């Protein structure tokens, strides 16, 4: 969303996300993500692939 605020096209944000894939949150470091991830993974059609 910050990159879109800087007037970037859909290609610029994608390559920005490609080089920043390691900044996604960790479940252990956040208590909120603990139950959200458990609830998210309980959906029928969720595949780890």
């Amino acid at each position: 969303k910050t990159r879109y605020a800087l007037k970037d096209t859909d290609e610029e944000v994608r390559e920005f996300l490609q080089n920043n894939l390691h900044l996604q949150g960790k479940v252990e470091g956040s208590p909120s993500l603990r139950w959200q991830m458990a609830l998210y993974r309980g959906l029928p059609g969720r595949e780890e692939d």
Partner: protein, 49 residues
Amino acid sequence: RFFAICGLQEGFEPFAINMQRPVTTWFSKSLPQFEPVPPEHPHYEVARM
């Protein structure tokens, strides 16, 4: 039963999401009791002579 349908994606959390014991609840008991007359009671005033 409906948190995922409406409320989960909007950023709302359950009121007791991370709590060990059930939330303590208080109820209005309809047993008359004697209590001191409030100093700011709209209708009743007590003067110490």
